[PDB]
Amino acid sequence: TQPALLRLSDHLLANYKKGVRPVRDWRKPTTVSIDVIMYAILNVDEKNQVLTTYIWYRQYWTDEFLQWTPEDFDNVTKLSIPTDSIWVPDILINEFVDVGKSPNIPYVYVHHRGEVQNYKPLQLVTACSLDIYNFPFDVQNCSLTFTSWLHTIQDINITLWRSPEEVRSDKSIFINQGEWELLEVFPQFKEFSIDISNSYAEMKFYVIIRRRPLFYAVSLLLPSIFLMVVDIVGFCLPPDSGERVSFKITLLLGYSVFLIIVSDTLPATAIGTPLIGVYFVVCMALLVISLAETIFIVRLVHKQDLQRPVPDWLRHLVLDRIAWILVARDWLRVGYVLDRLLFRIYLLAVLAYSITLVTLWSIWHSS
Amino acid sequence: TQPALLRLSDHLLANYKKGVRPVRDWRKPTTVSIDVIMYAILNVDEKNQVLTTYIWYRQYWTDEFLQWTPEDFDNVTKLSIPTDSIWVPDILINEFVDVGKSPNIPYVYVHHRGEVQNYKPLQLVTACSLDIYNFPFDVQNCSLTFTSWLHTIQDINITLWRSPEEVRSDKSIFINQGEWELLEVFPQFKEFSSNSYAEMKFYVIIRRRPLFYAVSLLLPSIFLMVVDIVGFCLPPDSGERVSFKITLLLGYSVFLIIVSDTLPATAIGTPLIGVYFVVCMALLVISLAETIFIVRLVHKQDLQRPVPDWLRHLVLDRIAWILEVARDWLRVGYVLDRLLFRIYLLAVLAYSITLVTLWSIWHSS
Amino acid sequence: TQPALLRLSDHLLANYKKGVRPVRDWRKPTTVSIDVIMYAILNVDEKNQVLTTYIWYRQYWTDEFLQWTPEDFDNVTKLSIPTDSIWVPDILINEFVDVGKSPNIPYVYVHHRGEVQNYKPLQLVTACSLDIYNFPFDVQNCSLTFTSWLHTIQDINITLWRSPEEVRSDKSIFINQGEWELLEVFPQFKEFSIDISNSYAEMKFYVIIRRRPLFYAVSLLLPSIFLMVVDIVGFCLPPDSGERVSFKITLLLGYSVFLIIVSDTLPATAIGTPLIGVYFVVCMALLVISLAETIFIVRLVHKQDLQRPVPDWLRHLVLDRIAWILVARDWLRVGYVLDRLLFRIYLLAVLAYSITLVTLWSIWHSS
Amino acid sequence: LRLSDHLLANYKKGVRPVRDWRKPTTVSIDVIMYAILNVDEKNQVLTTYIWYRQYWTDEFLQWFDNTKLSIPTDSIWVPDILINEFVDVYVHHRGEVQNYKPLQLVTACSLDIYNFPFDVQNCSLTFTSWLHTIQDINITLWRSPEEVRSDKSIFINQGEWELLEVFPQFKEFSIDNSYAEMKFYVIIRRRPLFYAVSLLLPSIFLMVVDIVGFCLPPDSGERVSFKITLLLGYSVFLIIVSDTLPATAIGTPLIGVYFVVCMALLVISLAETIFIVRLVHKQDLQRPVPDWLRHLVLDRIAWILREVARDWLRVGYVLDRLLFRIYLLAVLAYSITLVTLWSIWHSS
C-alpha cells in the first residue's frame, strides 16, 4: 500500500479548499500568533527613510480542517505541506516598501489535532521615521506593524506567541557587531478602528536602534575637536604677525577640505542636518571672518594703505568694545581689539561645541 | 452540517467562469472604480528616466454572479475569495515598466449584492521627463496613468472611488521627510482615443527638498568660492601664492569629485550649477598658470623684452581703464591678476543670483 | 511512436506529489549529500557585518518514487525533470540575508532507479564577524551553515558528497583575481535544538579569505610612513623658535586626511578604528600637544612676553626627572627640554608603529 | 488565439521537444551588446545590459484561426543555454520559434587596470550547455560568424565605457562526455576625460609647481614654507588618488606609481632643505664631517658625466641640483608614460 504520508496528504488535501478561512463556525475568529526575532539591521537609510532589517518570523494558527488522528495513519504525528496549498493569514507589514530578497520557505509544518506552524525569514525593507539631530549619538526608534490587510478583527486577531517580557531582550541570534546595536524590541497592541464597527486588528513592535558612535567619535569628532582647539590656539600668535597670517592661511587651506569631506559624510534629511553639523558651518564662518580680518590688518601693516584713511566710524566703537571685553596705531589697536573679540567668539563656540557633545553623549548613554 | 463558508464558496464558484464579464446583460459595461494614495517615492533617477513609487492601489466593482442571501448561508454577510478564481478587471498601467516586488494580497472581499473590493500595494516603476536642470531645486511633474488593456469604454468604465478633493488632499500616509515632497496628486480623466477605453491619469507632482543638499553641496561650494575670493588678493603675486593656488586647486579637485558622486549626470549633461563649478575650476586653473608663468619671468629677469609691446598698449588703454625690465612684466601680470579677480567675483555673483532665482521659482511652486 | 518517449515523464509525473518526503517509510530519515564549489567573492561590504559570495552548489538524494527502468523505452537510462515537479529539501544557508538572481536553473536531472541530482549556480549574502582591527593585512573568517527549516534530523540529514579534505583542497573553479584571495574552506557538521524536543541536523563550511594588502599598503601604509618620517626630521632639525608651527599644523592636517581616507575606505565598525588608525590618532594628539606647547612657550614667552618666570615647578621637574633622564633664556631652555621629551616619545611612537606593521604582516603572511 | 489550447494540451511545458530520441537538437543565439553600464574596476565584475536573442527549429510542434503565434514561453520549453560567468541577471507555423530578452549581466572578467585611466580591457562572455544538454549538443550563431555583429553595433551608451570589437568563436569541450559552447569577446575603452581633468591635471600641476620650487634659493626658508604647503598639497591629493584609483590584484596602476615616486622625492627634498637651513652660519654648529664623503659629494659638481660656512652651502647647492635633476627626469618619464598610454588607447 502507499506510504502513510501519501495517504495522509490525500486525506487532508484531496478536498481542501484554500482561501476559505479554516474554521467550522464562521463567526468564531481565527487566532494568529506571531514572533519576530531580529537578526541584523542591514541598513538605516536616513536619506530615503528606509530601515532595512533581516528578521526571523514565525506564525502559529489553528486550522480545523487539517485535523486528523495518528492512530489511523501509521501513528504519524507531523506532516509537511506546500505553503501555497493551505490557507495562510493575510498578515502584511504596513510600513513596508519592498518584499526584499527573502529566501522562500515552500513548506509549512502541521501537527495532529489541528495545528499549523510557519517559519519564514524576511529581509524587510521597512519605512521608518529617523532623527539625526543627535549625531553620531542618535538613539532611534522604529516600528513594525502587522495587520490583516482585509480581514477585520472578527476574522483575524493577532497575538504574541512569547510573553511581552521575553520578546523584549530576545537579542539571542542578533549579530551584535554591526554599526547599529539592537537595544530592545518592544511589542504593543492596538485594535485600530477605521469606522463605526469595521475595526481591524493590529500588532506593533518597536525596534530601538542605537548607533555605535565610536567610529564616528574617532573620525568626525576627534579631528574636528583638534582642528578647532588648534585654531583657537592660533590666536596666541601675535596679532597679524607673519606667523599669524601664514598659520591662518595654511589652517584654512587644510581645514576647508577637511570640512568638504566632513559635510559630505554627515547624513542629511528634511528634518535637519545634525546638530554637530551647525558647528562645522560655524567654524567655516569663523575661519572666513578670521582670514578676512587678517587681510585688512595685513594691508595696514604691509601696505601704505589703511594708515592713510582715518577710521571714519566713531571711536565710540573702541571704548564700547573694550568696555564689553574688559592713525596707523589706532588702526592697529582696532585690529587688536577685533582679534580679541574673535578669540572670545572662538572660545565661546568651542565651549558650546564640547558642552553639546557631552550632552548628546549623556542622552545616548541615558538610553 | 457543512461549514457555511465552504458551501457558500462552492455555490459561488461552481458555475463561475472568467470567460464572461461580471454582468449578465453582456452589452453593458462593468463600472470599475479606482483610488490611489501615494505612500512613498523611493527613487527618481536620470539614468533610466524612471520614477519608482509605492502606492496603495484600490479597485472596486460589482459582480452580478456573486449575489447571495446571507439569510440562507448562515447569515454570512461577507466572504473572502481567492483572486485567482474571481474575474478581475484587466487594468493596464501605461507609462509603466515594472511592477516590482509588490506583496500582492491573494484574496479580495465580496459582499451580499456582489460588491467587490480589491486592495493591493504596487511598487510601480513609471517613466517620466526628468528635466533635472534646476537641480537641486527642481519641481517635477510625472504622469501616472491607468488604462483598460482591451475593454473599450462600452465594456469597462474607469472612475474614481472618491472625489478628486480627497484624492489630492489624502497625503495622510505619505512617508514624508525623504528627499522628495509629494506636492499633489492631480486626477484627470478623458477618453483613451469610436470604441475608446475610459483612460485615466493621476499626475504625481513631486518637489525636491534642497535642504538635503544645502550642507552636502551648496555650503561647501559657497565656502570654497569665498575662500578663493579672500585668497586672491591677500598674498602678493610674487609671494609664492602658487602654493596656495595649487593646494586650493587640489581642494576644488577633491570637491568636484565629491560633487560628481552627488550631481546627477542626466542625459542633457550636468545641471545648471555644474556650469558654475566648471567656470570656477577654469578660472582657478588660469590663475595658477598665470602665477607659475609670472614667477618664471620674475626669477629669470634676462628676458629680451620688458613687455609684450603690441598687447601692453591695449592692456593699458582698456583693462586698466575698466577696473629691472622684469618690473614691467610684473605690472602686466598684476593688471591681468586684477582682471581675473574681478572676473571671479562676477562669476560668484552670477552663481549666487542664479541660486536665489532657483530658490524663488522652487518656493513659488 | 516517438512521443512514447514522453511516457517516461507521464508515468512518474501523474503519480508524483511534491508534498510528500519521498521515502519508503517516514521513520526512515532522508539523506542529502552536498558539494559546494566557490566563485570569486564578489565583495566584502558593510565591512562590519556582511559578506557576499558566489558558489556552485550540489544536492544528491534518493527518491523512492522516481523509480523506473530503461527497458520501458529504448533503454533510456536518464531523464531531465522540472524542479516544479519534484520534492526538494529546503536546505537554506542559515546566515542568509539576501538571495540573488542567478540563472536559477529550471531543470533537475534524475537517474534511472531514482537517484536524483541537482546542479545550480547560487549566489549568497552572508552575515559574518570581521577582524577589521588588523587592517589592512586582514585574514577574515566567515561561515556558511546549511539546515532545513522545520525538518528535524529525523526528516532531513546532511552530509558532504566529496571527502572533507577534497572540499578543503578543491579551489579549481575559483577565479583567483580580485581584492580578496580565498585561503581555505573547512567543512563541519553538528546539531542544534531551538523549537524541537529532538534536534535539527546541521552542516557548516568555514570559507577563509585574506584581502591582498597590495593597493591598501602602497596607498595608506607607504605615504603614512613618509609623513611620519617627515615629522621625525621636523621635530629635531627646525629651530625651536623657528617657523615650526606651519610645518606641524601641515602634518597635523596630513594625519587628519589620513583619518579621512581610512574612514572613506572603511565604514563604521564596532571596533572603533584599525590598529593602524589608532596610531594616526596618537600621532595627531602628539602633534596637537607639541604645537600648542611650542606656540605658547616660545612664541609668547620668549619673543614677546617679559622676563616672567614660573620657576619652582619647572626647576623641580628638570632637577628631579630631566637632569636624570637627559628668565627668557630659561623659558627657551625648558622649551628645548620639552622638545627633546616630545621627540623621544614620538620616536617611540614611530617604533611602535613599525613594530605593529611588521607584526600585522607577520600574522597575515602566516595565515 | 484558439489553436494554442490543443497544442499546449498535447505537449508539456517542461520536456525537451524533439521528433525522435537520440537525435541531438540544436539552438541558435544572437546578442546585441546593448549599453555596457559600469565596470566595477575591482578586477572582478563587468555590469552590462546586453540584449539576447534565441532561435531554434526544434520545438517539435508545427502547423486554424487563419501563421504567427506568441503564447509566452512560460508555457513552453526553453533551452538551457546560460552565460557561464552569470552573476545576477514568438513562433512561426513552420515550427521555428523566436525569443528576445534583455539581460543585465553582471558577468565576471579579468580586468587589466594598468594603463589607468587609458584602459583597454579584453573581456569574455560564454554561452554553454550544462544540464538537459544532450551529449551531441550543438550551438549555432546568428549572422555570419564574426559578421554584421562584429562592428557597427547599436552603441547606445557612452556615459563612461566606449566598447569596440566583439569577436565570436565557437568551441566544443569534453570533460571525459561532451559540452558545446560559444565564446564572445568584447573590448571596451574607458572614457579618460573625467579622470584626466580630475586627477592627471592636478598631478602634472604638482610636478610643475614642485619643479618651480627648485627656483627658490636652496638655503631660503621660503623653500621650507613652499615645500610644506606642497606636502599639504600631496596630502590632500592622496584623497583624490585613494578615491579614484580602483583596488587591484597588481597593487596600483602604472600611473599610480609615479604618485608615490614624487611623494618620496618631495619628502626627501624637505630633509635636504631643512639640513641646509640648519647648516647656515648662525646655527650650523660647524657640524664637522670626515671630508671624504664631502669631497665625493663636492666632486660631483665636476663629475656629472662665512667662508667656512660656504662649504656646507656648496654641499647644499650640489645636493639641490642633483635632486632637481632626478626630479626633472621623473617628470619627463611621467609625461612620456602619459603619451604612450594615450597613443595605445587611441590606436585600439
What DSSP string runs through C154-169?
A: TTEEEEESS-HHHHHH
Cα–Cα dist B255/B218, whole Å: 11
Cα–Cα dist C207/D60, whole Å: 46
Strand partners, D97: D56, D91
Q: What are the Cα distances from residue B183, in Å, to A258, A277, B129, B134, B359?
A: 36, 28, 17, 17, 16
C-alpha cell recorded at residue B166: 480627497
Residues of D in contact with C243 (CB under 8 A): 221, 224-225
In chain B, which ranges are E strands?
30-35, 38-45, 50-62, 78-82, 91-93, 96-98, 107-111, 115-122, 125-127, 139-148, 156-160, 180-189, 200-208
Number of A/B CB contacts below 8 angstroms equals 151
Number of A/C CB contacts below 8 angstroms equals 172
- Indicate yes or no: CB of C272 within 8 angstroms of CB of A214: yes
Residues of B in contact with D202 (CB under 8 A): 249-250, 253
Q: Left if phi > 0, otherwise alpha if psi is -120 to 50, otherwise beta: which for C274? A: beta
Strand partners, C116: C61, C110
Which of B:297-316 have CB within 8 Å of D? Answer: 299
Same-domain check for residues A204 and A218: no
Mutate to test the interface with C, among A6, A74, A78, A107 (most CBs of C within 10 A): A107
Nearest to A39 by CA among C43, C203, C98: C98
**Quick check: helix, strand or coil at residue D238?**
helix
- Indicate yes or no: CB of D228 within 8 angstroms of CB of A246: no
Nearest to A104 by CA among A88, A260, B133, A114: A88
- Indicate yes or no: CB of C42 within 8 angstroms of CB of D87: yes
Amino acid at A231: D
Number of B/D CB contacts below 8 angstroms equals 59
Cis amide prior to A136 (ω within 30 degrees): yes
* D245 interface with C at CB cutoff 8 Å: yes
Amino acid at D121: Q
Which residues contact residue B135 at a Cβ distance below 8 angstroms, ignoring those fewer than 6 apart? Answer: B208, B263, B264, B271, B272, B273
* A170 interface with C at CB cutoff 8 Å: no
**Quick check: helix, strand or coil at residue C237?**
coil
C-alpha cell recorded at residue A322: 573694550
Cis amide prior to B136 (ω within 30 degrees): yes
**Quick check: helix, strand or coil at residue A78?**
strand
Helical residues (DSSP H) of B234-325, grouped into ranges: 241-262, 272-300, 309-314, 320-322
- Indicate yes or no: CB of B256 within 8 angstroms of CB of D230: no
Q: At what angle do helices A222-234 and A275-302 cross, to 10 degrees?
A: 30
Please name the residue of chain C whose CA is at the shortest distance from the CA of residue D89.
C101
When CB atoms are compared, the residue of A43, A82, A233 closest to C292 is A233
Cα–Cα dist D247/D251, whole Å: 7
Q: What are the Cα distances from residue C179, in Å, to C44, C136, C176?
A: 9, 11, 10
Gyration radius (Cα) of chain D, Å: 33
Nearest to D333 by CA among D269, D231, D265, D268: D265
Cell 569665498, residue located: B226
Cell 446583460, residue located: B25
Which residues contact residue A196 at a Cβ distance below 8 angstroms, ignoring those fewer than 6 apart? Answer: none
DSSP H or E stretch at residue C60:
strand C50-62
- Indicate yes or no: CB of A179 within 8 angstroms of CB of C99: no
Cα–Cα dist C239/D264, whole Å: 24
C-alpha cell recorded at residue A101: 530578497
Q: What are the Cα distances from residue D167, in Å, to A37, B74, D34, D147?
A: 52, 73, 15, 9
Which residues contact residue C360 at a Cβ distance below 8 angstroms, ignoring those fewer than 6 apart? Answer: C134, C136, C137, C275, C276
Mutate to test the interface with C, among D43, D44, D59 (most CBs of C within 10 A): D44
When CB atoms are compared, the residue of B247, B253, B260 closest to D232 is B247
Residues of D in contact with B288 (CB under 8 A): 205, 209
Please name the residue of chain D whose CA is at the shortest distance from the CA of residue A243.
D225
Question: What DSSP line would sit under C91-155, residue for residue?
Answer: EEETTEEEE------SEEEEEGGGEEEEEEEEEEEEE----GGG-SS---B--EEEEESS--TTT
When CB atoms are compared, the residue of D198, D226, D229 closest to B253 is D198
Please name the residue of chain A whose CA is at the shortest distance from the CA of residue C48.
A178
Q: What are the Cα distances from residue A341, in Å, to A323, A324, C296, D280?
A: 12, 10, 20, 41
D143 with D123: CB under 8 angstroms? no
Pairing mode, strands B156-160 and B30-35: parallel
- Indicate yes or no: CB of A92 within 8 angstroms of CB of B81: no
- Indicate yes or no: CB of C149 within 8 angstroms of CB of A106: no
Helix/strand/coil (H/E/C) assignment for every residue in A180-226: EEEEEEEEEEECCECCCCCECCEEEEEEEEEECCHHHHHHHHHHHHH
Cα–Cα dist C345/B268, whole Å: 58
Cα–Cα dist B115/B79, whole Å: 11
Q: How many CB atoms lie within 10 A of CB A80?
A: 21
Gyration radius (Cα) of chain B, Å: 34
Residues of A in contact with B5 (CB under 8 A): 20-21, 23, 26
- Indicate yes or no: CB of C48 within 8 angstroms of CB of A261: no
Q: Give the distance from residue A246's alpha carbon to the nearest chain D alpha carbon, in angstroms.
A: 9
Strand partners, C44: C51
- Indicate yes or no: CB of A97 within 8 angstroms of CB of B220: no
Cα–Cα dist C161/C59, whole Å: 8
Annotate A159-171 with b (16+ C-beta within 10 A) or e (fewer).
Answer: ebeeeeeebbebe
Cα–Cα dist C209/C367, whole Å: 9
- Final residue of a structural domain among A157, A188, A212: A212
**Quick check: helix, strand or coil at residue B290?**
helix
Mutate to test the interface with A, among B37, B76, B234 (most CBs of A within 10 A): B234
Cα–Cα dist B202/B200, whole Å: 7
Same-domain check for residues D28 and D147: yes
Amino acid at B318: R
Cell 514568438, residue located: D90
A5 with C151: CB under 8 angstroms? no
Cell 493591493, residue located: B120
Cα–Cα dist D55/D172, whole Å: 20
Structural method = cryo-EM
- Final residue of a structural domain among C212, C233, C261: C212
A226 with C288: CB under 8 angstroms? yes
Cα–Cα dist A198/D98, whole Å: 52
Cα–Cα dist D256/B80, whole Å: 66
In chain A, which ranges are E strands?
30-45, 50-61, 78-82, 91-93, 96-98, 107-111, 115-126, 139-148, 156-160, 180-190, 202-211
* C76 interface with A at CB cutoff 8 Å: no
Strand partners, D116: none
Q: How many CB atoms lie within 10 A of CB C89?
A: 21
Same-domain check for residues B341 and B215: yes
Same-domain check for residues A99 and A116: yes
Residues of B in contact with A66 (CB under 8 A): none
Residues of D in contact with A254 (CB under 8 A): 232, 235-236
Same-domain check for residues B83 and B166: yes
Q: How many CB atoms lie within 10 A of CB B9?
A: 20
B216 with B262: CB under 8 angstroms? yes
**What are phi and psi for residue B200, nearest 5 degrees?**
-140, 150
D197 with D203: CB under 8 angstroms? no
Residues of A in contact with C303 (CB under 8 A): 238
Amino acid at A44: V
Mutate to test the interface with A, among D231, D236, D237, D243 (most CBs of A within 10 A): D236
- Indicate yes or no: CB of B254 within 8 angstroms of CB of D232: no
A5 with C155: CB under 8 angstroms? no
Amino acid at C98: D
Which of C:257-296 have CB within 8 Å of D? Answer: 257-258, 260-261, 264-265
DSSP H or E stretch at residue D343:
helix D309-347
C-alpha cell recorded at residue B19: 470567460
Cα–Cα dist C263/A265, whole Å: 9
- Indicate yes or no: CB of D14 within 8 angstroms of CB of C220: no
C-alpha cell recorded at residue C117: 541530482
Cα–Cα dist D311/D316, whole Å: 9
Give the distance from CA B320 to its chain's centroid.
47
Cα–Cα dist B327/D278, whole Å: 33
Q: What is the DSSP letter of C28?
A: S
Nearest to C140 by CA among C213, C204, C190, C214: C213
Cα–Cα dist C340/C338, whole Å: 5
Give the distance from CA C31 to its chain's centroid.
33
Which residues contact residue C61 at a Cβ distance below 8 angstroms, ignoring those fewer than 6 apart? Answer: C30, C31, C32, C33, C89, C116
Same-domain check for residues C131 and C221: no
Same-domain check for residues C177 and C217: no
**What are phi and psi for residue C137, nearest 5 degrees?**
-70, 70
Can you say whether the dihedral through the CA atoms of A15, A18, A19, A25 is positive or negative? Answer: positive
- Indicate yes or no: CB of A246 within 8 angstroms of CB of D232: no
Residue D303 burial by CB count (10 A; 0-12/13-18/19+): exposed, middle or buried? exposed
Cis amide prior to B29 (ω within 30 degrees): no
C191 with C200: CB under 8 angstroms? yes
CA angle A22, A26, A30 (to 5 degrees): 55
- Indicate yes or no: CB of B254 within 8 angstroms of CB of A272: no
Same-domain check for residues D142 and D118: yes
Same-domain check for residues D100 and D210: no
DSSP H or E stretch at residue C202:
strand C202-205
Q: What is the DSSP letter of B124?
A: -
Q: At what angle do helices B219-233 and A275-302 cross, to 10 degrees?
A: 10
Nearest to D239 by CA among A265, A348, A4: A265
Please name the residue of chain A whose CA is at the shortest distance from the CA of residue B232.
A295
Cα–Cα dist B362/C237, whole Å: 59
Q: Quick one: chain A helix, strand, coil %, rounded to 5? A: 40, 25, 35
When CB atoms are compared, the residue of C9, C82, C250 closest to D228 is C250
Residue span of the structural domain in which C113 resides:
1-212
Cα–Cα dist B64/A50, whole Å: 43
* B99 interface with A at CB cutoff 8 Å: no
A231 with C253: CB under 8 angstroms? no
C-alpha cell recorded at residue A235: 590666536
**Quick check: helix, strand or coil at residue A158?**
strand
- Indicate yes or no: CB of C229 within 8 angstroms of CB of D130: no
Same-domain check for residues C257 and C184: no
* D198 interface with B at CB cutoff 8 Å: yes
Cα–Cα dist A56/A243, whole Å: 63
Q: What are the Cα distances from residue A289, in Å, to A285, A341, B79, D222?
A: 6, 11, 73, 27
B330 with B294: CB under 8 angstroms? yes
Cell 601664492, residue located: B241
Same-domain check for residues B171 and B221: no
What is the count of structural domains for chain C?
2
**What are phi and psi for residue D221, nearest 5 degrees?**
-60, -20
Amino acid at C331: W
Cell 503564447, residue located: D71
Can you say whether the dihedral through the CA atoms of C289, C291, C297, C300 is positive or negative? Answer: negative
Same-domain check for residues A312 and A219: yes
C-alpha cell recorded at residue A348: 565661546
- Final residue of a structural domain among D191, D222, D243: D191
C-alpha cell recorded at residue C298: 616660545
- Indicate yes or no: CB of B219 within 8 angstroms of CB of A155: no
Q: Give the distance from residue A265's alpha carbon to the nearest chain D alpha carbon, in angstroms.
A: 14
Q: Give the distance from residue C100's alpha carbon to the nearest chain D alpha carbon, in angstroms.
A: 6
Can you say whether the dihedral through the CA atoms of A338, A339, A343, A344 is positive or negative? Answer: negative
- Indicate yes or no: CB of C299 within 8 angstroms of CB of A238: yes
Nearest to B273 by CA among B102, B74, B136, B114: B136
- Indicate yes or no: CB of D226 within 8 angstroms of CB of B247: no
Q: How many CB atoms lie within 10 A of CB A23?
A: 19
In chain D, which ranges are E strands?
26-32, 36-39, 46-48, 50-56, 68-69, 82-83, 91-92, 96-103, 120-128, 138-141, 166-174, 178-189
Cα–Cα dist A252/A287, whole Å: 6
C-alpha cell recorded at residue C280: 594616526
Which residues contact residue B65 at a Cβ distance below 8 angstroms, ignoring those fewer than 6 apart? Answer: B12, B15, B16, B22, B24, B114
In angstroms, this model's resolution equals 3.9
Residue C48 burial by CB count (10 A; 0-12/13-18/19+): exposed, middle or buried? buried
Cis amide prior to D117 (ω within 30 degrees): yes
